[PDB]
Amino acid sequence: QLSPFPFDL
């Protein structure tokens, strides 16, 4: 499984 949806820049 992949990392959670990343934070916004």
Next chain:
Amino acid sequence: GPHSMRYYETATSRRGLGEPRYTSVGYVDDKEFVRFDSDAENPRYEPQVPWMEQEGPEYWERITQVAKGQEQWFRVNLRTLLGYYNQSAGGTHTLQRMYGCDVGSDGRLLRGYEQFAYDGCDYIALNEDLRTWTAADMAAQITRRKWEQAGAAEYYRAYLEGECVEWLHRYLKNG
């Protein structure tokens, strides 16, 4: 000795013609094991080594829609970096994301990763402690300021300490 998992997500702008190409490639140790390309006719997801075939159709289908979502993150965030850097909309740019985990035989975690590069220059990086951030320039400072306040490090730490390691040994238990 030690072992690692690594994911390289890359998005590049194209002049005029619609959405940016999206690339996601997975590495176990330093060997490529999984790949996603948006340019492919039926983009999906795929296996790059024989020992990754034993994975169910649910694994591939879920992991694909995750990448389909990731494209939206990049579309949006390429756009915000144009704002931060005061760049024209008629240009092309590259945004790469790397995350993953390092472990060497204690079945434990050594190091976590969450870092970004913009046009081949370091932007922001999660530090060894997974609490602090290294920001390269002024634009990255803005990101660093709100990630520290919001608690992004703790957000990423839930994956890096848990699932990242678990799936790595799940993958390592092969070949």
Next chain:
Amino acid sequence: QSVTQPDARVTVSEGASLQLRCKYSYSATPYLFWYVQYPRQGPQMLLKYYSGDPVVQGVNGFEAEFSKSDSSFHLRKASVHRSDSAVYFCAVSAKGTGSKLSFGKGAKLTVSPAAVTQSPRNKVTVTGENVTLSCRQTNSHNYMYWYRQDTGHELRLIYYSYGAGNLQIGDVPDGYKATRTTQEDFFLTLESASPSQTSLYFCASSDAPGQLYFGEGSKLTVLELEHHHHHH
């Protein structure tokens, strides 16, 4: 999935100690939030939990403790003021959908002796009318939300959006259209207003998974006129 708050109504004396309970049943340990809603206002986040230290510090003097084995995220405050009289919402975010915020039923507390602008504070119409609720935010947030709250209950998600032109369905979208025309603007449209669509509508924006900044509310009443009449 689900979040559970055992008591809809809680009364404590001024100066006393408070504990508001919350238990979740989820397949994977979710992102956990507490929100406060003062009369005539949108909810405001108190504190949040992603991972790490199981004890988190909130605003207005609140703190919460997470417990994995107990699957609980109880809220507490040392000494309650009269101004703490509000409705308290335990709230949760699913691990795979971090930005979709879901509310608990809520606890009304009686203690006895957000640059999000939404255009129509109050509106009354009749069945069949076209109603548009406007929402503008200057926070440079990429996430925007439209909730509705039936008086006495919790906020229920209608639609949300990530970036301009994006639309993602919530829990209760039937009868509504939404449009995210720009980064700052998120319209909600009732093409043919129904009396079931009378409630308090809250817009929100977010910068971080589950951390939402709510507007001040758009209260809409739609009347079937024939209903409030005895036929002659």
